[PDB]
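In response to a reviewer's request, we include the raw inputs and outputs for one of the modeled complexes. The twelve entities were modeled together in a single run.
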Amino acid sequence: MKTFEILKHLQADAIVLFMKVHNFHWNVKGTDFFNVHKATEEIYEGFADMFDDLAERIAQLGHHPLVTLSEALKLTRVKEETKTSFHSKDIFKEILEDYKHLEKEFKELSNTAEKEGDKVTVTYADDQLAKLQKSIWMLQAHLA
Amino acid sequence: MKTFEILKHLQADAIVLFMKVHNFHWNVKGTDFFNVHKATEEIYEGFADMFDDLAERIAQLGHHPLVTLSEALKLTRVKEETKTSFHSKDIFKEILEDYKHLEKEFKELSNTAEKEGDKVTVTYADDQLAKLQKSIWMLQAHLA
Amino acid sequence: MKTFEILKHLQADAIVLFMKVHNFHWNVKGTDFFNVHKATEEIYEGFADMFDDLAERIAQLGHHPLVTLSEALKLTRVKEETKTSFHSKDIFKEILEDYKHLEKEFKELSNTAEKEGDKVTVTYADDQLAKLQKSIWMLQAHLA
Amino acid sequence: MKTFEILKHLQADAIVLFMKVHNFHWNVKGTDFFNVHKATEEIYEGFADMFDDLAERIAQLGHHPLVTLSEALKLTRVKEETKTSFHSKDIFKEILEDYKHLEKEFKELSNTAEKEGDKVTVTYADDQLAKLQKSIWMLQAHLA
Amino acid sequence: MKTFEILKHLQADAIVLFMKVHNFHWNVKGTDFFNVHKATEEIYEGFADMFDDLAERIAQLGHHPLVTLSEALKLTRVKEETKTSFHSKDIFKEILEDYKHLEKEFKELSNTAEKEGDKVTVTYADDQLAKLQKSIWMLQAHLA
Amino acid sequence: MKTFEILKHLQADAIVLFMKVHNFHWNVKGTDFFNVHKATEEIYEGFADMFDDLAERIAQLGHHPLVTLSEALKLTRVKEETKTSFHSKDIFKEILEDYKHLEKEFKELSNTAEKEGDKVTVTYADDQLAKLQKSIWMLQAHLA
Amino acid sequence: MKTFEILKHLQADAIVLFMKVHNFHWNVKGTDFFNVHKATEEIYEGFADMFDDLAERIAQLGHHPLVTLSEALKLTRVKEETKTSFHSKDIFKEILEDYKHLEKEFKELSNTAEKEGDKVTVTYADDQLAKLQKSIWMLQAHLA
Amino acid sequence: MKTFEILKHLQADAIVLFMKVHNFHWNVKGTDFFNVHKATEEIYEGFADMFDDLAERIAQLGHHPLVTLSEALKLTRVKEETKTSFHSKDIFKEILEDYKHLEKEFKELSNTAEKEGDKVTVTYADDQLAKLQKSIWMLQAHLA
Amino acid sequence: MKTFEILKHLQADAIVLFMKVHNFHWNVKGTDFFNVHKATEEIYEGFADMFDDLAERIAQLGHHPLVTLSEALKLTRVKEETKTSFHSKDIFKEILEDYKHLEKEFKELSNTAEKEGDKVTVTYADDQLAKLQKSIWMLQAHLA
Amino acid sequence: MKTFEILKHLQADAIVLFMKVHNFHWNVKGTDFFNVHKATEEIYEGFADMFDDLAERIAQLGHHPLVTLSEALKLTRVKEETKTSFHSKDIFKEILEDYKHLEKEFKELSNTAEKEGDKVTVTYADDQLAKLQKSIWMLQAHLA
Amino acid sequence: MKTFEILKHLQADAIVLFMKVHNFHWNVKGTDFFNVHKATEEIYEGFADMFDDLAERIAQLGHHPLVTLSEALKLTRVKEETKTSFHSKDIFKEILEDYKHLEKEFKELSNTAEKEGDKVTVTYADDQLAKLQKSIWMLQAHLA
Amino acid sequence: MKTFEILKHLQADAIVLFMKVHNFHWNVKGTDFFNVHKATEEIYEGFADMFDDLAERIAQLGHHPLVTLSEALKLTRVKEETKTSFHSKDIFKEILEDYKHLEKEFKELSNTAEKEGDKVTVTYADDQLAKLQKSIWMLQAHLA
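The model returned the following structure tokens for the whole complex.
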């Protein structure tokens, strides 16, 4: 895909992941409620920020960001979670895999943008890689 | 509808309106760009906050908030805007009508919750009414 | 009176009371100067804030707030004080009675607005009642 | 009971619950020490704030708040806990039930005050209901 | 006029101009609503601050500041505006002329106070001149 | 008494004195209302902080702080005040004597802890002595 | 006197007045202790700031500020107060007269500096006049 | 050009553009005065910051930054604007073209520095590209 | 010269002096590097602020501030420094003389503006005199 | 040992314990990752601060603090941990024992310094005792 | 001497040392002007704070602090410096010796107060010892 | 070396350099004490931060950071300084060479990580290069 296409598919993923973790946040139960409730809040707010950042990047490239939730559902690589009951460990296992997916895509974003000479998208992509790698490391350690 | 049902339909409206104004924000053009760009940012962030507030309210009542974007599209009373080109005046005219819709619904929320003896949802609903009435007044004055 | 009429008469009272306490502030003498000088500053600034709040409320209802000081003098229930010399105790006795008047009127505002289904003016009115009741309690205790 | 009587019994409950959770705070042991130690600090400080708020409300109504700890023990509906050893889960189970008791009483406070036309106590009571409902929801989720 | 007399007439102008711009603020309509609404807020708050400053100056000179709104209407050189409908350009044109009037008067204040050896009123007057000259320059540029 | 016993009796005094001054705070009347109302707020908040500090100290020594208000009433050296009406001078006279009592006890706390080699309780005790001596000096000067 | 000589005599007065009010501060007794204790703190800190300001002004003119307390006692127009017991009213009466003295001297400072074309000392002097006139007005009102 | 030469020519452009927009800032007239006046302030301050940043970069490379305004005029690619009267739209059109020029040059800076293995200048250059691309996007949207 | 002409020549000096000290800042060497590097930063930022202040003053008088760097070089009384190597002492000696020049000119500005009845430029000029006199005093002391 | 010798051995312990807990911090795994990761960060930063404090104390006594890591390893009483895998409970058990060691040593520091009349080291030592006793109490409670 | 007598002699020293270093501050010349000018400001402000602290301590003990500068000159152990010209090194050498004197006296203060059982003066004295020892160490290192 | 190996050797250097500059900090003497004392504090805190940053980077790559000070001494390229006496110039000369070493290594880190496609370590490395180049430039200028 071209840079702007990778960006638009990521923007779709971001809002879908926002919604998914928003769902986790309100439906988490058990002895680790307070840590997971707080963590999921930070995680979905991060996806919301990513949604905004990606839109900004698409616009600056001269293209239209996502127009509708319908378009987000069309472009997303992320499956919608319909469950309302889950274990806290499974939540973090799920989020971890979503992080690993995003990491793969941002690496591709970085490589594709560099080939096009899009220096600004490279910077953005590599900065997101840094944030993702920290998040992945912590979740992996927690689940170890 | 029962209180929690009104709340869930509002939560659906909130995210759909977030997306709609997010679209306006990135696609606004013309001599009033800077004022409308800034205003639309504040407006969609307000809808995002409403989304969170409504979810909180639904959860505290012992029900599940929206689980997916699919469910949001199912429950919403708001039509998705597919356009990417518009005049700044039309943006504010659209948002005004959306505000008027939300005002009607929050009034119903307030009345229904009071009848059920749900004092906390009444407070929340009336506070949202206050915010909506200010927003409506300003947009009406601007378009006058 | 209708809600907006009660509001406009209150707005008139607010500016007249602002002026009255502004006069007290600059003309207070005696051993309790520093406490009364400071208290009267806080009191007239409170009336100034009320003036603004009431104007906002009238405008949002689709009516015109006070246009002139002439109109304020016409609508006010508060007598203008022409004196420049007084005792600090008499100042607080006067202000107390003005507070009691405002309390009566805001109670009426709350009841009238509720009957009209004006939920936002009810909230505003009850919040002002809270502030007035605290002020009344302190002045009563001071004069006891 | 009249409004001021409900308020005085609540003020008694507040200080007794402050003491109870203060005891929990200093005597909690085990792997969840740090979360429960911190949570119990926030909880007893909340009861201390409630004690102050209720006193303020009683005074403004023209009555005397609690004068002594003896009077608090006389009026309280809350049993004093003499234990110094407990499990962290039992602490939260206890606090939950105390919250549910307070919720019942504040609902009664709200209804009784409204019938008397005491608009300010209604506002206070409904605001406390909001805080209690959030606390109850979180504890219920944690214990689920 | 003597210094204190110029000051008292200015104090009268300040509150009358406060009221006038307060009226503009709530009644402004049209595409430049948000800029004019905000500007008029800053302008009337400036007149309110001037009212306070002038009162302080009169008191420190051993005289009584304005006692009533009646006295303000008697002493003012500013005509009360009864209109509730106007164009945003006309608002700024009006305010500009009011600024030019105030500038003339503060220049006289400065000259008269210097002749009397009132060094403190000179400083105050010249500082107000600075603020007025900035405001005039901006309004003139806007209307050019 | 041993260190922890002195500490527990002080903790009992702290909450009883909190309650006593809380009572003074809400029931003070007269021309010095505002100064005494504010002073009594600071004083009872100081006793509340002392209650917390003493509990912390007892716990760190490996003992249980006060468990109940019943236990506080058993251990206290302070008489409960049942009055609701008093003069502001008598309030400060009472508090002064309570301060002098606390000063005696903290001196004993310091001496006893030093003999036991409890260096941390010595530091705490001497710091409280400093705070008490300032408070005593001011009240003595006020009543002189 | 020349400008720098007026400044040096003022610097001497400032430290002597600092000491005088420092003495008042620590020795004030009676029912108005807390207000006078606080006021005297602000007053002596003001004289300390004046001491620094005057030194700065003398240095910038190419002269040496006060070198010793001996030199301050030599140059001062202010009598040292040896008393340790006084009434709070007498304190404010004394300070008032000291303010009136400083006012006379700063007026002379302003006039002398202007004649020499020392524009910076004029600004400083007139600013100090403003501060003195406010202080005088408040003390006069308090003693009225 | 070598890296340091590109940097020095950019530093020259920065100060010339600072001056140009400084001129626009003070000479802008018309109904959009307040937005353009504010925007031009932010724009020239940005060029001033760029001037400083570029100087820092040149120095760290072991070369001398611009020594004089004469040298800036010699090295600049930007034409000096002698006009004092213009339309607000033309101002933004001009600035846009200047931004596009700077964008071209910073891209070259980034490429040249990378070829030399100057990793720090690459980072700086790409960061400036990001800022320029945002500015260009907004001006383009405004003029669309 | 007329006031606005003195101001425009000063504005020219300000930017030329900014550039001169900017050059010193980046080229200073030796054991006092860190103090001189920091001092020169503060000094050139001061000249930059003066440039802005003078422009503001010229505009408010109804004239055009400097339009170009060419015009600055034409109007300046300050010689451009082409050197890149110097001793830190010589830097401060140079800056001192530039300060003394500015002091002479601002004194003339103050006198000329007063004769014209331009009270606002007098205030500005005298305030700048104060800042210059402090700077001169410190540099003189350092070089003594 | 003399005071300075106890201090130098403590400084050695501090850096060795810093390193040990730094190792724990990065290698902690499991369901309590986030609490232990955060706690270990605070703990090693505390040891780093202690390292600095002890160095300061040694220097002020006229001796040289630790010069090298070699010297730290020579003087330390703490065994280096070579493991990279451990349970979170064992981490806290280890740290607890290290705290108990430090407590013993700081008690000796306090006693030895007092005998020498080193009042400042006594204060420092007793303050560290306070911090250690809190830390010990919390870890003991957590492991209970 | 008794505790209060040591304190009063120290209070005398504090103001005399304030004056001495105030003199140094304004009369320092040479290449190290900026460091010594700043250091002497911090030093004399420290002596001013000590003056206040000592007065507080004397008052709390039931005695009168210094009443006059005459009494300060009578009680002081510090010789007044009449010089206006000195080297920066000599300034620090002088201050060092003054610090060493204060250190001796505060050690005596600590010992004497402990013998009297004055725990609060011991704490104060030892805290001042800490501050003095840091200051001495830095000056000694600077002069080494 | 592989990326993680370069990182681990750098982490070893960081703590060894921390210790070295910590030693300089406490043992610096002479007329430039205050500047060098402060500079060395900032420098060793920078090395401490680098130690933490490098550990984070190693962990995120799935490897173990330094476990012990023994391992740091094994891996370090930096010679331990045993001296306690030195000239301030020699300190900065030493630190400069250490900076130049770190610069070489971070350049290698950047190149090696890029070849491996480790985009996050490249960003980190280049950011550290920027910080090092600034530090080197300042030290070189100071020693010139």
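As requested, we also summarize the result in words. The first helix of chain B runs from residue 3 to 27. Chain B has one domain: 1-144.
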